[PDB]
């Protein structure tokens, strides 16, 4: 979903 | 190791240009984004622009839209700011900024920064 | 975007004190928030990450705490080490924004 996680 | 070095700074005239480059060492950029951030001297951390790896998703702080322009090189592992119609106010040491986090844990980087004075 | 609202703008406290630093979110950023440390003339340090994990290296005396739009960072007991300014940041979306920090001094 968050573009700087996972 | 990772390493993120700024070059560009120094003075530039109210109302001229001034490129600033941020060169990225020990990862490649093919994964999330780069940032620049700029700190006025004795004020706060100013988030400025982003950029993706492949150049998309590019966002600009309201305070230097129109007037800032984020890129990379497609050939190297470089990221770019022209930065235009310079006032007094952008005067700010401007680091290049890396931060993405994993299942391995935070990846956050800073590098040592460079001073733009505008200056007449 | 989203606005960053930090508290207090500065603060002294004695050694072994406990520090207590608060920021809000102008809307909710679930747990997408940052703690950085910047001691003077240095680039600023990540402490804290999703509002309540630590950075390795980092020592066990800072905390983070909150959800949504109300987090809080907290020194357990303040070291002259930890003399710096500490700024709040979300990281919800593609860019960032920080509070506007919080300098912490200490009474000797």
């Known amino acids: 979903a968050n573009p700087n996680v996972d | 190791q990772v390493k993120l070095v700024e070059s560009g700074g120094g003075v530039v005239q109210p109302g001229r240009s001034l490129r600033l480059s941020c060169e990225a060492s020990?990862?490649?950029?093919?994964?999330?984004?780069m940032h620049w951030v700029r700190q006025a001297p004795g004020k706060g951390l100013e988030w400025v622009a982003v950029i993706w790896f492949d150049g998309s998703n590019i966002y600009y702080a309201d305070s230097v839209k129109g007037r800032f322009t984020i890129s990379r090189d497609n050939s190297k592992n470089t990221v770019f700011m022209q930065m235009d119609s310079l006032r007094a106010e952008d005067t700010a040491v401007y680091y290049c900024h890396r931060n993405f986090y994993d299942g391995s844990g935070p990846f956050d980087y800073w590098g040592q920064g460079t001073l733009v004075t505008v200056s007449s | 975007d989203i606005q960053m609202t930090q508290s207090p703008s500065t603060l002294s406290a004695s050694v072994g004190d406990r520090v207590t630093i608060t920021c809000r979110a102008s809307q909710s950023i679930s747990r997408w928030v940052a703690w950085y440390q910047q001691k003077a003339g240095k680039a600023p340090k990540l402490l804290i990450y999703k509002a309540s994990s630590l950075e390795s290296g980092v020592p066990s005396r800072f905390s983070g705490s909150g959800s949504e739009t109300d987090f809080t960072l907290t020194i357990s007991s303040l070291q002259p080490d930890d003399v710096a300014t500490y700024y709040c940041?979300?990281?919800?979306?593609?860019?960032?924004?920080f509070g506007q920090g919080t300098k912490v001094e200490i009474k000797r």
């Open positions: 940041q979300q990281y919800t979306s593609y860019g960032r924004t």
């Open positions: 020990g990862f490649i950029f093919s994964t999330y984004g």
